[PDB]
Amino acid sequence: NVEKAIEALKKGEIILVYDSDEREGETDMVVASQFITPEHIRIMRKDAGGLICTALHPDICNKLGIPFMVDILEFASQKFKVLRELYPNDIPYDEKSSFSITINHRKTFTGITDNDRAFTIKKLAELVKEGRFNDFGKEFRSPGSVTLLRAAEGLVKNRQGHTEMTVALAELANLVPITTICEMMGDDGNAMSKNETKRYAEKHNLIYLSGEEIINYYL
């Protein structure tokens, strides 16, 4: 199943990845960022509905100098004390946020359109694939509409969220290890259930993958 998903990812398709019954119980739509298109963004906002985020392998984040947002906030809590009052000291270690900074490519206008978000994401994957790390500040500004996620060092060995699972899948596919993901939201106000997301994958001829399978394959 993992290898079939890898082929789909290599063709620029959206695949569906469920994490686990014990974790978020959520399914994310996932695409290899180097193949992102405005159409992928349109499908994610209409049929998934969560935040459209782009996850990056830790090696990439280290080359760009991008930290976890929690660390930006903790340091800034020295000046803005409310940040200390909002510390996420109550989240299980396994669910600790993978949130990093938000960005827009400088050539975009408001940054939120399908065209703007696909351009921001595709240009970031381009810059990374080409190794033009120093061009990051030249080409992008923060804050913006595309939320970046920082994958755990060691990926699924140390954290088992969609952030790590999808980046691990891109690494396995021999692609730039950067993915764009969006949580699938249900009409009942909760996340779409695994039965509901498997159903959507069947209707749209998409690959549906369980996180356990990616983890096992990777390890």
Ligand X SMILES: O=C(CO)[C@H](O)[C@H](O)COP(=O)(O)O
Positions that interact with Ca ion (CB under 5 A): 94, 202, 205
User: Hey, how many other C-beta atoms are within 10 angstroms of the C-beta on 77?
Assistant: 15
Q: How far is the CB of 195 from Zn ion (least distance, A)?
A: 18
Using CB under 6 A, count the residues that bind ligand X.
Answer: 14
181 is in the binding site of which of Zn ion, ligand X, Ca ion, none (Cβ under 5 to 8 A by kind)? ligand X
Range in contact with ligand X (rule: CB under 6 A) among 57-65, 82-90, 159-167, 197-205: 159-167
- Considering only residues 57, 117, 159, 162, which one is a binding residue for Zn ion as defined by CB under 5 A? 162
Question: Quick check: 213 binds its own copies (CB under 8 A)?
Answer: no
The CA distances from residue 190 to 19, 55, 62, 186, in Å, are 16, 23, 35, 5
DSSP E strands, 70-150: 99-105, 140-150
Neighbouring residues of 218: CB distance < 8 A, sequence distance ≥ 6: 155, 156, 168, 172
Peptide bond into 92 cis (omega under 30): no
174 is in the binding site of which of ligand X, its own copies, Zn ion, none (Cβ under 5 to 8 A by kind)? none
- Taking Cα atoms as reference points, which of 117, 91, 113 lies closest to residue 102? 117
Q: How far is the CB of 32 from its own copies (least distance, A)?
A: 20
Indicate the residue among 38 and 212 with the shorter CB distance to its own copies. 38
Indicate the residue among 130 and 178 with the shorter CB distance to ligand X. 178
Bridge-based pairing of strands 140-150 and 15-18 is unpaired
Distance CA 149, CA 30 (A): 13
Q: What number of CA atoms fall less than 13 Å from residue 137's CA on the CB side? A: 5
Closest residue to ligand X, judged by C-beta, is 161
Question: Quick check: 98 binds ligand X (CB under 6 A)?
Answer: yes
- Considering only residues 4, 12, 130, 141, which one is a binding residue for its own copies as defined by CB under 8 A? 141
Distance CA 91, CA 93 (A): 6
Which residues carry a binding-site annotation for D-ribulose 5-phosphate? 23-24, 28, 159-163
Distance CA 55, CA 160 (A): 13
- Taking Cα atoms as reference points, which of 191, 173, 165 lies closest to residue 30? 165
Residues that bind ligand X (CB under 6 A): 19, 24, 28, 51, 53, 94, 98, 110, 149, 161-163, 181, 183
Residues that bind its own copies (CB under 8 A): 24, 26, 38, 42, 45-46, 49-51, 64-67, 69-73, 75-76, 78-93, 97, 99, 101-103, 106, 109-110, 112-115, 118, 136-138, 140-143, 145, 183, 185-187, 189-191
